[PDB]
Design an enzyme around this catalytic site. Structure first.
Site, PDB file in Angstrom:
ATOM      1  N   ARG A 278      29.683  41.064  27.142  1.00  0.00           N
ATOM      2  CA  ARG A 278      29.356  41.487  28.513  1.00  0.00           C
ATOM      3  C   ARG A 278      30.575  41.548  29.449  1.00  0.00           C
ATOM      4  NH1 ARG A 278      27.648  36.403  27.737  1.00  0.00           N
ATOM      5  NH2 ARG A 278      28.286  34.789  29.235  1.00  0.00           N
ATOM      6  N   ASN A 279      31.606  40.748  29.155  1.00  0.00           N
ATOM      7  CA  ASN A 279      32.898  40.807  29.857  1.00  0.00           C
ATOM      8  C   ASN A 279      33.978  41.617  29.105  1.00  0.00           C
ATOM      9  OD1 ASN A 279      32.005  39.058  32.067  1.00  0.00           O
ATOM     10  ND2 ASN A 279      32.090  37.392  30.565  1.00  0.00           N
TER      11      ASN A 279
ATOM     12  N   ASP B  38      36.692  39.836  33.141  1.00  0.00           N
ATOM     13  CA  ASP B  38      35.832  38.743  33.611  1.00  0.00           C
ATOM     14  C   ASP B  38      35.078  39.213  34.860  1.00  0.00           C
ATOM     15  OD1 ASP B  38      34.842  36.297  34.900  1.00  0.00           O
ATOM     16  OD2 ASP B  38      36.167  35.188  33.556  1.00  0.00           O
TER      17      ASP B  38
ATOM     18  N   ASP C  57      34.857  32.039  29.562  1.00  0.00           N
ATOM     19  CA  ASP C  57      33.634  32.862  29.543  1.00  0.00           C
ATOM     20  C   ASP C  57      33.865  34.164  28.760  1.00  0.00           C
ATOM     21  OD1 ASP C  57      30.963  33.688  30.098  1.00  0.00           O
ATOM     22  OD2 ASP C  57      31.551  34.613  31.993  1.00  0.00           O
TER      23      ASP C  57
HETATM   24  C1  LIG Z   1      42.548  38.834  32.740  1.00  0.00           C
HETATM   25  C2  LIG Z   1      41.297  37.952  32.779  1.00  0.00           C
HETATM   26  C3  LIG Z   1      40.360  38.382  31.650  1.00  0.00           C
HETATM   27  C4  LIG Z   1      41.705  36.489  32.581  1.00  0.00           C
HETATM   28  C5  LIG Z   1      40.602  38.121  34.112  1.00  0.00           C
HETATM   29  C6  LIG Z   1      40.143  39.327  34.648  1.00  0.00           C
HETATM   30  C7  LIG Z   1      39.572  39.070  35.860  1.00  0.00           C
HETATM   31  N1  LIG Z   1      38.994  39.994  36.743  1.00  0.00           N
HETATM   32  C8  LIG Z   1      38.213  41.049  36.383  1.00  0.00           C
HETATM   33  O1  LIG Z   1      37.916  41.293  35.226  1.00  0.00           O
HETATM   34  C9  LIG Z   1      37.679  41.925  37.492  1.00  0.00           C
HETATM   35  O2  LIG Z   1      37.305  43.246  37.000  1.00  0.00           O
HETATM   36  C10 LIG Z   1      36.470  44.037  37.724  1.00  0.00           C
HETATM   37  O3  LIG Z   1      36.063  43.670  38.807  1.00  0.00           O
HETATM   38  C11 LIG Z   1      36.038  45.356  37.195  1.00  0.00           C
HETATM   39  C12 LIG Z   1      34.824  45.937  37.608  1.00  0.00           C
HETATM   40  C13 LIG Z   1      34.426  47.167  37.105  1.00  0.00           C
HETATM   41  C14 LIG Z   1      35.228  47.848  36.180  1.00  0.00           C
HETATM   42  N2  LIG Z   1      34.838  49.090  35.648  1.00  0.00           N
HETATM   43  C15 LIG Z   1      33.583  49.562  35.468  1.00  0.00           C
HETATM   44  N3  LIG Z   1      33.678  50.749  34.928  1.00  0.00           N
HETATM   45  N4  LIG Z   1      34.908  51.065  34.746  1.00  0.00           N
HETATM   46  N5  LIG Z   1      35.674  50.111  35.154  1.00  0.00           N
HETATM   47  C16 LIG Z   1      36.433  47.269  35.765  1.00  0.00           C
HETATM   48  C17 LIG Z   1      36.837  46.043  36.265  1.00  0.00           C
HETATM   49  N6  LIG Z   1      39.683  37.726  36.080  1.00  0.00           N
HETATM   50  C18 LIG Z   1      39.256  36.991  37.202  1.00  0.00           C
HETATM   51  C19 LIG Z   1      40.111  36.029  37.748  1.00  0.00           C
HETATM   52  C20 LIG Z   1      39.719  35.284  38.853  1.00  0.00           C
HETATM   53  C21 LIG Z   1      38.470  35.487  39.427  1.00  0.00           C
HETATM   54  C22 LIG Z   1      37.616  36.444  38.894  1.00  0.00           C
HETATM   55  C23 LIG Z   1      38.002  37.191  37.786  1.00  0.00           C
HETATM   56  N7  LIG Z   1      40.327  37.170  34.966  1.00  0.00           N
END
Ligand SMILES: CC(C)(C)c1cc(NC(=O)COC(=O)c2ccc(-n3cnnn3)cc2)n(-c2ccccc2)n1
Length: 291
Positions: A150-151, A164, A146
């Protein structure tokens, strides 16, 4: 698990930033987190609800910790002591990349950015950083499934990072096609083998980056916006492809077509795509003006 932990008394919530169906995000002060910074700002994702969700929280925290890299979303740790379970992220000034692109489009300044539309060199700077993150994920052989603007979050100095977000399923619900009841497919970013055969690989990720490359030079327009979901599925499977945007120079549109080869084995690698974009980004004004 082997994640880092943060005490609740160090975190102090200021106000809400956003609210998804499965998570709220707050701005907050965090004390004693980094050495040089005694008091810094952070984004704090609070978990909503359920016994099944506690496990999904666990999986996220592990993945995030082991998949840290300069152009992947920065993650400090969790707060397990007492409900609700918090996740502490680095705060990113400009929000998601799609919103940022739309606010600096051809629809007519600041601290980080000059006034009006983003320049060719500035657009290429964004494309290169997103490309840099996908080289790292491809290297460890992790599939995103995905990839979209937006991500992607943007920070001070126009630093772009891949993530994500579950909030994207609420805010940009139009960008997904609902299936089954609880499944949601981002069909406009998916290749033919993913739509037809339901196979996701590193080659299916490159196709999505090609669509992400199209988003940037359209200043955040939806791909196939004129078509409905069913109309878009017919269009992609039958081999019809997106037009070159007005901002996009011919050389850059060659790189999009490079990602969009029908058979997966004949598509370019993400490493070679990054090589072009980084080289193009750092090229001098004399070269980029004639481009
Ligand atoms: C490395 C990668 C890409 C594989 C990945 C990353 C994630 N998780 C995220 O991205 C989560 O981030 C935030 O919740 C978040 C919210 C709000 C903010 N912020 C707003 N304003 N500033 N920061 C910054 C992060 N994954 C995931 C894996 C399994 C299930 C779901 C997700 N997988």
């Amino acid at each position: 698990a082997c994640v880092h932990h943060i005490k609740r008394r160090d975190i102090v919530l200021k106000w809400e930033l956003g609210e998804g169906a499965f998570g709220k995000v707050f701005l907050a002060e965090c004390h004693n987190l980094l050495p040089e910074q005694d008091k810094m700002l952070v984004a704090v994702k609070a978990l909503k609800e359920s016994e099944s969700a506690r496990q999904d929280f666990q999986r996220e925290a592990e993945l995030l910790t082991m998949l840290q890299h300069q152009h992947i979303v920065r993650f400090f740790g969790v707060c397990t002591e007492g409900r609700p379970l918090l996740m502490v992220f680095e705060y990113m000034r400009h929000g998601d990349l799609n919103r940022f692109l739309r606010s600096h489009g051809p629809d007519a300044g600041g601290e980080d950015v000059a006034p009006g539309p983003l320049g060719l060199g500035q657009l290429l700077a964004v494309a290169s950083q997103v490309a840099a993150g996908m080289v790292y994920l491809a290297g460890l052989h992790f599939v995103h499934r995905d990839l979209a603007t937006r991500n992607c979050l943007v920070g001070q100095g126009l630093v772009v990072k891949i993530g994500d977000f579950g909030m994207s399923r609420d805010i940009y619900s139009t960008d997904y096609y609902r299936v089954g009841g609880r499944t949601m497919l981002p069909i406009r970013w998916m290749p033919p083998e993913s739509i037809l055969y339901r196979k996701f690989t590193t080659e299916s990720d490159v196709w999505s980056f090609g669509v992400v490359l199209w988003e940037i030079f359209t200043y955040g327009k939806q791909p196939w916006y004129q078509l409905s979901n069913t109309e878009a599925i017919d269009c992609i499977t039958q081999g019809r492809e997106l037009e070159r945007p007005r901002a996009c120079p011919p050389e850059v549109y060659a790189i999009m077509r490079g990602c969009w080869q029908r058979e997966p084995q004949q598509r370019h690698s993400i490493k070679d795509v990054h090589a072009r974009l980084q080289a193009l980004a750092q090229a001098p004004p004399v070269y980029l003006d004639v481009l």
